[PDB]
Scaffold this active site. Structure first.
Site, mmCIF file in Angstrom:
data_model
loop_
_atom_site.group_PDB
_atom_site.id
_atom_site.type_symbol
_atom_site.label_atom_id
_atom_site.label_comp_id
_atom_site.label_asym_id
_atom_site.label_seq_id
_atom_site.Cartn_x
_atom_site.Cartn_y
_atom_site.Cartn_z
ATOM 1 N N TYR A 52 0.817 -1.208 0.000
ATOM 2 C CA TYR A 52 0.000 0.000 0.000
ATOM 3 C C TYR A 52 0.851 1.258 0.000
ATOM 4 O O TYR A 52 0.442 2.287 0.537
ATOM 5 C CB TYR A 52 -0.926 -0.015 1.204
ATOM 6 C CG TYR A 52 -2.047 -1.013 1.058
ATOM 7 C CD1 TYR A 52 -2.985 -0.887 0.038
ATOM 8 C CD2 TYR A 52 -2.176 -2.065 1.950
ATOM 9 C CE1 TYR A 52 -4.023 -1.802 -0.091
ATOM 10 C CE2 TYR A 52 -3.204 -2.971 1.831
ATOM 11 C CZ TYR A 52 -4.117 -2.840 0.821
ATOM 12 O OH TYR A 52 -5.136 -3.761 0.722
ATOM 13 N N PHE A 60 -5.617 7.866 7.172
ATOM 14 C CA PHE A 60 -6.076 6.602 7.752
ATOM 15 C C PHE A 60 -5.298 5.406 7.207
ATOM 16 O O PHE A 60 -5.828 4.300 7.071
ATOM 17 C CB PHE A 60 -7.584 6.433 7.541
ATOM 18 C CG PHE A 60 -8.360 7.665 7.909
ATOM 19 C CD1 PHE A 60 -8.213 8.237 9.166
ATOM 20 C CD2 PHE A 60 -9.173 8.293 6.985
ATOM 21 C CE1 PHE A 60 -8.901 9.393 9.503
ATOM 22 C CE2 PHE A 60 -9.864 9.447 7.316
ATOM 23 C CZ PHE A 60 -9.732 9.994 8.574
ATOM 24 N N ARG A 88 -9.637 -7.586 -13.172
ATOM 25 C CA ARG A 88 -10.302 -6.466 -12.513
ATOM 26 C C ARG A 88 -11.784 -6.436 -12.856
ATOM 27 O O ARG A 88 -12.624 -6.113 -12.008
ATOM 28 C CB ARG A 88 -9.638 -5.147 -12.919
ATOM 29 C CG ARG A 88 -8.186 -4.996 -12.470
ATOM 30 C CD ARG A 88 -8.083 -4.485 -11.046
ATOM 31 N NE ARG A 88 -8.442 -3.069 -10.949
ATOM 32 C CZ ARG A 88 -8.093 -2.260 -9.946
ATOM 33 N NH1 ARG A 88 -7.360 -2.707 -8.938
ATOM 34 N NH2 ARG A 88 -8.486 -0.992 -9.949
ATOM 35 N N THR A 94 -14.222 -1.430 -7.781
ATOM 36 C CA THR A 94 -13.529 -1.520 -6.496
ATOM 37 C C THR A 94 -14.463 -1.206 -5.336
ATOM 38 O O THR A 94 -14.428 -1.881 -4.295
ATOM 39 C CB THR A 94 -12.331 -0.577 -6.490
ATOM 40 O OG1 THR A 94 -11.454 -0.931 -7.565
ATOM 41 C CG2 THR A 94 -11.597 -0.664 -5.144
ATOM 42 N N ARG A 105 -17.485 -8.681 -6.482
ATOM 43 C CA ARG A 105 -18.010 -7.721 -5.520
ATOM 44 C C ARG A 105 -19.493 -7.468 -5.725
ATOM 45 O O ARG A 105 -20.200 -7.151 -4.762
ATOM 46 C CB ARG A 105 -17.221 -6.430 -5.597
ATOM 47 C CG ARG A 105 -15.809 -6.594 -5.028
ATOM 48 C CD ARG A 105 -14.872 -5.671 -5.728
ATOM 49 N NE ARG A 105 -13.538 -5.625 -5.146
ATOM 50 C CZ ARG A 105 -12.486 -5.214 -5.833
ATOM 51 N NH1 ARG A 105 -12.654 -4.869 -7.102
ATOM 52 N NH2 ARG A 105 -11.280 -5.160 -5.276
ATOM 53 N N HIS A 118 -8.586 -8.093 -3.921
ATOM 54 C CA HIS A 118 -7.763 -7.112 -4.614
ATOM 55 C C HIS A 118 -7.265 -7.723 -5.914
ATOM 56 O O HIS A 118 -6.978 -8.920 -5.975
ATOM 57 C CB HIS A 118 -6.529 -6.680 -3.775
ATOM 58 C CG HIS A 118 -5.430 -6.078 -4.603
ATOM 59 N ND1 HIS A 118 -5.456 -4.767 -5.031
ATOM 60 C CD2 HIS A 118 -4.295 -6.617 -5.111
ATOM 61 C CE1 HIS A 118 -4.376 -4.519 -5.751
ATOM 62 N NE2 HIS A 118 -3.658 -5.627 -5.821
ATOM 63 N N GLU A 129 3.658 -6.355 -7.452
ATOM 64 C CA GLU A 129 2.932 -7.053 -6.395
ATOM 65 C C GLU A 129 3.284 -8.534 -6.361
ATOM 66 O O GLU A 129 3.454 -9.112 -5.280
ATOM 67 C CB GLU A 129 1.431 -6.847 -6.593
ATOM 68 C CG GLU A 129 1.044 -5.408 -6.323
ATOM 69 C CD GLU A 129 -0.408 -5.107 -6.652
ATOM 70 O OE1 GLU A 129 -1.134 -6.004 -7.136
ATOM 71 O OE2 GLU A 129 -0.819 -3.953 -6.428
#
Ligand SMILES: Nc1ccn([C@@H]2O[C@H](COP(=O)(O)OP(=O)(O)O)[C@@H](O)[C@H]2O)c(=O)n1
Lengths: 154, 155, 154, 154, 158, 157
Positions: A52, A60, A88, A94, A105, A118, A129
């Protein structure tokens, strides 16, 4: 373009907790993508902070990292033509509120901070990644028996 | 208005048959409320495939498209229902799976346009032509679904 | 998309019950993370259905719509969660199944708009009215899902 | 037991009417058996009387013939090792009330006279039924891409 | 018969190369997930021959030993550890009879497999052999410690 | 022995763990797909007195209070299903009462482990179904309707 493109797909702690490992894997399997690496892992905080890195100067950040430390993650590498972009699309928007039923999702998630999974957003971010989450030895080289029925060309 | 006895031709291509997608694809049309009126597993002759794809006869990949369509069995079907041609195409998803949506057949199961697991007629008139090409008229079975009046409000 | 205790009214219409779609439809809302807070199989009286369709009382098809909705049982439900009204309608798909997307309930199961399997409230205010019309207050069940904190960000 | 054994499986008119064609095909597909012939047919009464000739003295005979004429039949030939015996196991007990959940009849059927499907009860009876229901050119010769992953040898 | 009573029992489940090749990873995982068992370790792996020979050490006096090892080398394996009450014995019941000919529809092999030499999956046959297999296939740090949110709805007692 | 009356009814309940674990849809689908007819259903959190009556035959047992307390701990999906042999076949669909003894392919063989968390209940006899149906449902909550596919599920009335 090429059928050996790779992407990083992760099932997040909420996806694992809610028993979505099997169904999510099936979505990619059924599409014809090839699983080339997978492990269940609870990665160290430093690894999540690197994953990240783009969010480290955003609000946050600590809470995101703490949440992603709060349960296991099913980390995966999937391989196939345009697997980054199509992966994706399979995951869905997302934010689950914007996702379409028939996506992961759109079938399973509601909150963007609990969006189950993800997927790498670009070919170059996928390579980064994959390197972050997997040792090269963990990427398994194999040939699907149905390769020539999924693909018309290399 | 669109009538409930419209018919379309749906074929599961050799890659669909090889990859074990016959059951799932049939279930998509069954569950929607469409009526199976003809079906056969067939390995059609090259001449019939060349007629089916005559619109593409002058393209260079024609010889290879026909060769792939000869390379395994095909599940040929006629499905009947209101707007079944157009809605059937939507259920299959975009012809190129790269552009298809998850929830469609190609969006769930396919990647390459040359391996897009199925075919559906693109118009009512092309459906009639494809049905006459792939089926004898006696292979279309006349019957009435027990739930016809729960799928349809008229026609 | 504000509070996680938003409620919507979802009904499985006579054709959905007749065609054996109760299980699948409930599973769509269950799998998404919404919470079932009320449910009953019911064949409501004409006056209730006329009240339910009160906004269509001056349309010429009103009487035929009420008579059709009397023609078999209805599985009446209240589902709770963030944005459940609008996301619920998205899960059902376009009101006219001809315009609906595969992956939605109507895009998987329905053809004719007059046989569109289900209904969902079209606004938060209409949901409150429909919930009050179809259920007694003591038929709404207060409970907390074991996976609430994995579906919703705390 | 050779992997080219063949059996006749039919989805009876109740299986077609109740929308079970897809699921029943999937059961045989998923197990690894190879579909070598299939057609939707409404056979003549003579063929059905020949199919059930051994039961031509039983009391339920003429009623069985009439019901087998009452809608389309999905006729199939499936191929694979011990497909006759294993196919019957997949169908479940002839009387669904004696069948196990997880079989076709144990998942979908109740009455023996509405038991959704037929499967040949022996290798020799399969050969007879295949010859009765199919012309030899309706049996398709092909080789599954996953043959060597379903079978250790032929 | 006898069943385990400890909810922290663990078993080793492997999806064999034929299960991976035939696209059964998702369905098989879902079977264990749906039953209430907890996944505590998983990886896709192509282990070396020495590890497979150790995995099959109990069968090293059998004529099919070498062929079994060579076959397990022939593609990737999805290796898994599942945790829950009676997971060794109930896990095998979920897989179905080792020879798919004897297996029941509704089990993994009864739904997906035909030949015993292509029976899609493996499950430890005893609590002790599960301990051995878990330690053979996984490094100790690959066993993941977590608590299922629905534990108290799957189990009535510890 | 199996029942022969197509209007036999049984009481099926999805217990709080079945509801909590998201099994309402799958369980309903098992009975729907089999050909049984749903004639009553409601989500309910019944009072303790009703659960004590439902388990009346176990009021002497030492686990009674805890069994009642657990059945109170979440909502219950209460149902009445109608069809030939639905009591006995319904129990077969649910699987053995102890999931450890149940077969994959049944509800408990697919979804459950502990007998005290066995996700569902089915009446164990025609008579106990009649009693349970009357206990859990008001008479007017049983719905009269005729399935479009009755004559395809059943060969005789
Ligand atoms: N009491 C009975 C016993 C058998 N049958 C017959 O048993 C048949 C079972 O299906 P099938 O004949 O295709 O298969 P098998 O009898 O070989 O198992 C029913 O469909 C009827 O043909 C019946 O109708 N009533």
């Amino acid at each position: 373009s090429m059928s050996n493109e790779q992407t990083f797909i992760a099932i997040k702690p909420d996806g694992v907790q809610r028993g979505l490992i099997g169904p999510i894997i099936s979505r990619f399997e059924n599409r014809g993508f090839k699983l080339v690496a997978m492990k269940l892992v609870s990665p160290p905080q430093s690894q999540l902070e690197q994953h990240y890195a783009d969010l480290s100067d955003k609000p946050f950040f600590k809470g995101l990292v703490s949440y992603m430390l709060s349960g296991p993650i099913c980390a995966m590498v999937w391989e196939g033509r345009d697997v980054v972009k199509t992966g994706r699309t399979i995951l869905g928007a997302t934010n689950p509120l914007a996702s379409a039923p028939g996506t992961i999702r759109g079938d399973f998630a509601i909150d963007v901070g609990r969006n189950v999974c993800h997927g790498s957003d670009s070919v170059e971010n996928a390579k980064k990644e994959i390197a972050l989450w997997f040792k090269p030895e963990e990427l398994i080289s194999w040939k699907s028996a149905t390769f020539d029925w999924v693909y018309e060309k290399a």
